[PDB]
Design an enzyme around this catalytic site. Sequence first.
Site, PDB file in Angstrom:
ATOM      1  N   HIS A   1      38.463  39.424  31.597  1.00 13.82           N
ATOM      2  CA  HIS A   1      39.750  39.341  31.902  1.00 13.82           C
ATOM      3  C   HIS A   1      40.243  38.146  32.300  1.00 13.82           C
ATOM      4  O   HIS A   1      41.362  38.047  32.779  1.00 13.82           O
ATOM      5  CB  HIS A   1      40.019  40.292  32.943  1.00 13.82           C
ATOM      6  CG  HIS A   1      39.468  40.350  34.495  1.00 13.82           C
ATOM      7  ND1 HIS A   1      38.140  40.954  34.651  1.00 13.82           N
ATOM      8  CD2 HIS A   1      39.953  39.791  35.510  1.00 13.82           C
ATOM      9  CE1 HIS A   1      37.897  40.325  36.226  1.00 13.82           C
ATOM     10  NE2 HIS A   1      39.124  39.990  36.525  1.00 13.82           N
TER      11      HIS A   1
ATOM     12  N   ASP B   1      33.968  44.128  29.867  1.00 10.59           N
ATOM     13  CA  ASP B   1      34.761  43.083  30.547  1.00 10.59           C
ATOM     14  C   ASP B   1      33.972  41.931  30.982  1.00 10.59           C
ATOM     15  O   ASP B   1      33.923  41.556  32.375  1.00 10.59           O
ATOM     16  CB  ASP B   1      35.195  43.749  31.892  1.00 10.59           C
ATOM     17  CG  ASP B   1      36.179  42.622  32.664  1.00 10.59           C
ATOM     18  OD1 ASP B   1      36.802  41.700  32.253  1.00 10.59           O
ATOM     19  OD2 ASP B   1      35.827  42.536  33.779  1.00 10.59           O
TER      20      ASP B   1
ATOM     21  N   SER C   1      38.799  41.418  41.340  1.00 13.14           N
ATOM     22  CA  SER C   1      37.416  41.590  40.996  1.00 13.14           C
ATOM     23  C   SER C   1      36.787  40.459  40.719  1.00 13.14           C
ATOM     24  O   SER C   1      36.765  39.863  39.626  1.00 13.14           O
ATOM     25  CB  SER C   1      37.358  42.545  39.919  1.00 13.14           C
TER      26      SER C   1
END
Lengths: 346, 396, 396
Positions: free
Chosen positions: B68, B98, B165
């Site tokens: 991401h 991801d 994150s």
Amino acid sequence: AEVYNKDGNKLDLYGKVDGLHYFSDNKDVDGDQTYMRLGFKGETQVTDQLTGYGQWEYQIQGNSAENENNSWTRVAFAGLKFQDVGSFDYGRNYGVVYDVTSWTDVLPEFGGDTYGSDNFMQQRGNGFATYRNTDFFGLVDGLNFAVQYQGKNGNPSGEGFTSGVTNNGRDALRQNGDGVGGSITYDYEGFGIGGAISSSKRTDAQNTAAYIGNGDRAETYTGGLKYDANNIYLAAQYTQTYNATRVGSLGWANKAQNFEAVAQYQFDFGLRPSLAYLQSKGKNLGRGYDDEDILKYVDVGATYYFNKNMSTYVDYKINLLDDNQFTRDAGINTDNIVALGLVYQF
Amino acid sequence: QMPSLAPMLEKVMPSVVSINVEGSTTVNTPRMPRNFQQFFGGQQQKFMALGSGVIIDADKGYVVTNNHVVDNATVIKVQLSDGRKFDAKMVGKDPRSDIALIQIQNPKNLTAIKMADSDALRVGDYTVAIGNPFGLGETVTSGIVSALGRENFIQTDAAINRGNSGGALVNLNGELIGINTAILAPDGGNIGIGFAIPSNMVKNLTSQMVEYGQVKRGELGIMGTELNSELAKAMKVDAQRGAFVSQVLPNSSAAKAGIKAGDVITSLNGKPISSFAALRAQVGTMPVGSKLTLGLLRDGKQVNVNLELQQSSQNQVDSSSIFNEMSNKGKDQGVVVNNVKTGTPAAQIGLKKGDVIIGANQQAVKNIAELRKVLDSKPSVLALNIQRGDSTIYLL
Amino acid sequence: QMPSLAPMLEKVMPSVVSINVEGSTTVNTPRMPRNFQQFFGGQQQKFMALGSGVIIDADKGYVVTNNHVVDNATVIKVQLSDGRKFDAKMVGKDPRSDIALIQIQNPKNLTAIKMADSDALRVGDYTVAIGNPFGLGETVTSGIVSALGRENFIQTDAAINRGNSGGALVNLNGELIGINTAILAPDGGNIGIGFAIPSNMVKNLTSQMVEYGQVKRGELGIMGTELNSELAKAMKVDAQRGAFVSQVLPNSSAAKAGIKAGDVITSLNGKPISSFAALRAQVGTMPVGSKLTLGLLRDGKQVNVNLELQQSSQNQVDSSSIFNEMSNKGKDQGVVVNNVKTGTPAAQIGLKKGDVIIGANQQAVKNIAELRKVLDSKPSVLALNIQRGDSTIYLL
């Protein structure tokens, strides 16, 4: 934009600047069309059930030189709303017929012109007393109705008129006697269905030999349909009118049949193309005009939304009216128009 | 004196890097004016992203990070913890997990973290996360292993309230146990606790990007959802307990082999399929060319078929060191190019929609790892021995 | 090697269970259409709840949990940490403390946690919480004792951002120190930190549910609030520094003995009462039949009286193993039934609004524990020796 929200009063100050240009063989509409609109909507909590409100909206043309000012009030009204009962407001507002016809007035620039402003109870106008009931005392979700009265707006004062005068009088094409109207709409999920009726006394100034479409009263009957879900917008309205639809500067149509339809789609990336068709067919017009198209066009356009505050659009009016004696006499535009607009709003 | 995590953090930090991505994307054209009391409803737009990564191969300058962060990157910069700056290029990415791989251009004196064995993790185990929460830099936070999934996403309370994150999840020995991710896609930011891909899966997905160009994950090419969706109702589906097929993907195996929107898969190789979820996850435990027979439902329909590489994990302007969306085709049967674009820099070079490339500008290109292995060694003369099925042309 | 909480967690987990509740409730009938730009202002509706619980008696299969999970349950399921599934029935609940007791139906090989002594807790003490945050399963998070109230709600930073108030709070020895709760009633979810009922209070409230049917907490039966409320102003209250009496509950001791809305209690047994709060908490430190004289304020009014069991903690369809809202009456003076409903399955059986049950279908039923102790041993012939004051009938 909400600029105030304190102790139960809220004020929203809103507006837009539309940098706008028309391209047309018709030089009366061709050129800079830039304008701005400004307005406010205020609300005050009186009790847990009762709210008072007011709204005002104003348009100021941005396309004139500094030695003139072309501006006007679109709406100006005050009202009361009671939870699960209804609302009442009075002032310059929209006629109840617009509750239904507004559903197709969604085009980037054009559209919404089988009727006009100050045109009996069809769109914006003065002296509307409007009663509305939403959801039928809160017992039928989506069902709304309205009943509306319009007071006479007559001949100008101080101009030597000996009858039919009001303080706020005006030219006959924008006059009205007392009127009454009503609307019902039902919306379930994405679907919508609606109907409206208006009946206005016509003034003596309107019923002279100088205007076609003489008659005791102006009446309108409207049906409409809508679909609004899954990024698709579809709507159509059909209206039959009697001594109510203007025929340019000539006066009014003895009878007219108006139809508008629109199809729109909203892409995720911000583009919203639009396709529409409008026509107004007049009948038994008088002066040998007989049956004639008052309006007929296909509108193809698109808006690109950068966000909720900035957008740009192109709208192409493909005008199917042909240049003839009738349209010349009435001053009705028969040429195509391309509009290009860039809009900031708050 | 007093206990501290500073002593192992000093042996770990040199492996954690910062990442600054610059890139663009397609946004819709704003319609003006803007009316905030009017709930409505193409141009490239530059954006900036920033995240953390972990040096996983000191020699090759291989850094693992979240997809991401680098997704849609045009320019990806890396800054070591000592402050040295480098440039990086995409080598691989996989939106499902991801997880993405990058390579520092021109590495010099780098340190790589040691990867621990994810399989030996247990819930009361201690955990330490390292990331760049709000941009202001490299923050470390501590905690424990909260839930061991059992895909084995690792759950840990070493997260951050309202932050993006981060990246590395390390044990008390300074070994990599997981890369922290964002399960709030196309957002970044957490649900309240932390989710990490386990180190063993990171190792595995990462090697694939290296030795193939992408990860070998086959797709059934259907797209759809649950039996609650407006379309499952607006189309009234009989017997609801499975995956709703909203559409069968074009040029797919589901398409090729046979299937049509509406049928609700009920099983996969005999086993019950009660939700798209169950299915999306099951098809993810099967590498390309595999064969999986599943039962559909229309009146009582069922078929058997073989899937091909997914389309989510693909490559772009990093195959040819130059600049310009291919992916692998079946086994080592060359590199098949997919949907070409509008700017057409690569289409302009004689490359259509389905053009394979078995010729390594002269040699064998069974895959993007190899192909790219050549467009990096001999940047002089380039003749792409491409053959999109029949036509076997040789463009420059 | 490295320290870890996994070794004690393995000795603890077998005592933590998951709980799935299914039940219904009364919701208002939706009025359509729906207008989202119109701020407005009976049918049963099924809902699903899920939470954690702790095995507290291995033999009886007694599991402690939050009342906000099992409240209104029709069906309560329990799944052990090893995956075995069981059914459970309500045995007790107490909305004040947000604590409830249940019993696994047909336990086999269970493990119970050991309860530690809450009174020995200190602030820097280490803490570990175990719960089911977002449904996805059993998550453990760690931390310390933040605040020891001193009711002694325990405060701890071992919570979860945006998650539902889990269940067990355990010390480093694997002993139960508190059950985590939700102080955001009829919501679940935390304020930012964690609140637990201390283990010693859990033990105490829990035994009452077992040996009586409910917890012995007497209510003064008034209902009201602070002196800020719109009604304290809309009614202009003189001398404001106490509890505002908005209403005196029907058939109550406050009602019976004497009191009327408006009076603001100023003291309770000589001591100052500056807030409903102070009062609600003080009356909660007094078991049924107690006598507490308090000073009221109208012009200068004061009385003395004795309270009866509260109405918040009551029973329903779990007294008679069959299916169908009683509670205890004073000391061991039978079981008094309260407000009957509309479906009337139990009223249909000759049970009015104030019907006691001293006859255990033949024997002594001084309480719901006993009564229920009989409607479980001899499910054959049942004749309820009920006597609602005068009428001493014997229904089946």
